[PDB]
């Protein structure tokens, strides 16, 4: 079915639930023919979060890119995750990926960027995290005194 | 403590003694968990009569003390204390009576959890002749 | 080097005669040969046996081991072939292996070792070739 170039027949033969090895071979074949459509479905069934994202995050509306990177957020596959959510000026779960991983500073930083002034809460949670994670001279528990700066220090 | 000795060369009999005694007393003098852990290993590699002994004892142990029932279940599901041969048959009975049934029977059955017979004190006469032979 | 040393051993617990192509395995040579060749190089009557992360190739002759050692390797056929050529050369010098006669012809054997394996690369030798040197 791959040889014939019968994508559909190869697709039934894989069978939508699992047989990921079949689907990865099919997904590549689908990208070759530049039939992106069959490819997105093959990659989904394959799973292939890293690869699947690359085809998928080319959306500009993030239409089917969040799912295949939902995990990535909290797996420390943050990079895969950021591309998914930030793609049309939206913060879909951009911030959230950063909180999940423990890369709290980065959520604060993002919050400042697009300023809905969410920063005040993120900086706090983060600052608290510095005090627990042995910093005393950059301890952060202040509003601008102990290193980092909560939202009134910050600005648009 | 004595059971700490040797896992399966200690014989059917010692395992049967710690097992019978731990079943029957239902230790609150020491935690039964050491006893159970010691007996559990011995059963695997020792004779049928003790492994069969161990399931039935456990059942009586259940009926006398409520607390005990959780250990009975981990032990009996195992391929050892049940599902060997003789051990299975006795177990199927003993288990089913504890698990399934009223335990009118189980309750009745434990009167302390005593031995199968009460003879005299055999050792001392035996010993008298046996020593200067 | 690919070939650490080419060594004749007695399983008395010592390297009877041995060759260090370039200064590396001096004293090291004796300890390896002494422990491993005693156990048949830890073999089972197999020409290749590897122990303590050193490849030992051998042939038993009496209470003695003729031993080739490597810890790296370029080809299968080659390691045996230098040992083999060595085994044509060794009875010419010592009439089989035997510790006292091996001991007496340290010079003979040692010279052959340098000639046979040069800077760990297995050159070839022959009993006539050996003659020009000891002449």
């Amino acid at each position: 079915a791959l040889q014939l170039g019968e994508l559909k027949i190869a697709y039934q033969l894989a069978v939508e639930a699992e047989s990921e090895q079949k689907w990865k071979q099919l997904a590549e074949l689908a990208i070759s023919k530049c039939q992106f459509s069959l490819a997105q479905e093959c990659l989904h069934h394959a799973q292939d979060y890293g690869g699947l994202l690359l085809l998928a995050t080319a959306s500009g509306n993030a239409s089917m890119v969040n799912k295949l990177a939902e995990g990535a957020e909290r797996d420390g596959k943050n990079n895969v995750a950021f591309m998914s959510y930030f793609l049309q000026g939206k913060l879909d779960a951009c911030l959230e990926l950063l909180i999940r991983t423990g890369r709290l500073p980065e959520a604060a930083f993002l919050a400042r960027t697009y300023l809905p002034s969410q920063v005040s809460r993120v900086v706090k949670l983060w600052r608290e995290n510095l005090s627990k994670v042995n910093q005393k001279a950059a301890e952060s528990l202040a509003d601008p005194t102990e290193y980092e700066n909560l939202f009134p220090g910050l600005k648009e | 403590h004595l059971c700490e000795f040797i896992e399966d060369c200690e014989f059917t009999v010692l395992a049967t003694r710690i097992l019978h005694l731990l079943g029957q007393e239902g230790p609150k003098t020491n935690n039964p968990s050491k006893y159970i852990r010691f007996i559990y290993n011995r059963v695997v590699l020792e004779h049928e009569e003790v492994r069969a002994g161990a399931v039935s004892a456990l059942a009586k142990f259940g009926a006398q003390n409520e607390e005990m029932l959780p250990s009975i279940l981990v032990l009996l599901k195992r391929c050892v204390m049940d599902d060997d041969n003789e051990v299975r048959d006795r177990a199927t009975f003993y288990l089913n009576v504890l698990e399934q049934k009223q335990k009118a029977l189980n309750a009745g059955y434990i009167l302390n959890g005593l031995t199968v017979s009460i003879p005299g004190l055999e050792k001392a006469l035996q010993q008298y002749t046996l020593e200067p032979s | 080097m690919v070939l650490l040393a080419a060594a004749v051993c007695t399983k008395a617990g010592k390297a009877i005669v041995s060759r260090q192509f370039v200064e590396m395995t001096r004293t090291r040579i004796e300890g390896l040969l002494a422990a491993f060749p005693k156990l048949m190089n830890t073999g089972k009557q197999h020409t290749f046996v590897e122990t303590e992360s050193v490849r030992y190739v051998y042939q038993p002759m009496e209470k003695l081991y003729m031993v080739l050692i490597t810890t790296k390797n370029s080809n299968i056929l080659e390691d045996l072939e230098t040992l083999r050529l060595f085994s044509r050369v060794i009875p010419e010098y010592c009439r089989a292996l035997e510790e006292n006669e091996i001991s007496e012809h340290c010079f003979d054997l040692i010279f052959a070792f340098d000639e046979i394996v040069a800077l760990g690369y297995r050159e070839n030798v022959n009993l006539a070739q050996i003659r020009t040197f000891t002449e």
């Binding site: 530049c34 992106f36 459509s37 690359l54 943050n78 990079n79 301890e139 952060s140 005194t145 600005k155 | - | -």
Partner: protein, 252 residues
Amino acid sequence: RTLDLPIYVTRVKGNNVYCLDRECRPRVLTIDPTEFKFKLALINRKYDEVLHMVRNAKLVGQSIIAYLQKKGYPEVALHFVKDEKTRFSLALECGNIEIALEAAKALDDKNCWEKLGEVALLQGNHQIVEMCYQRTKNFDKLSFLYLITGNLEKLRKMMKIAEIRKDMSGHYQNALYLGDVSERVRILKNCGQKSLAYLSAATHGLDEEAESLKETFDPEKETIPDIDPNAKLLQPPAPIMPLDTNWPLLTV
């Protein structure tokens, strides 16, 4: 002090301690102001007293030159910092990693630069993180960080030096993060990922670049995937004028 024989203390009466063994040969020993003065001084937070106190009858390795790197709010730590490791340690315990990078440098090691860079992001400032992360070669982590940080100039630098690595979750990121996607289109072209390059480009309305990729490679751009292939991509990149590489700080 050590004597040259095994012994039993006879007892302590006075400064001396007196000893006798089984055979009963004596040893006496004056209780010194060596080890005793040094730590009597360190306990009462004196470092100035303690420098004199440092002698080679009591220096050891870790009671003076590295035991004094054992405060989570550095005090003792500040005083002995001579080891490149003790210096590294000192820095995370403050939370100011400016010293870390140098110790990390002098430890000649990448791992330290990425870990201090992470601590750096924690004190809040990403300039310091960039430098570290750049030399550990985590251009892709940086690429990810960078819109989060709100830089666009720095974000481009990462894209190129991650292009060459073919880090598809590095080079790939930045194009999304700026309002136009063109960065990806070329990187992907070089990857040979013509499909991916077209989809990305096309959606932003850079159909012309998308077409270039199709024409150079296998065409067919018409196909509509489970994602859009031509719907607007535009994002307003970072509304902040001062970025989070320029995250404010005072530091205590």
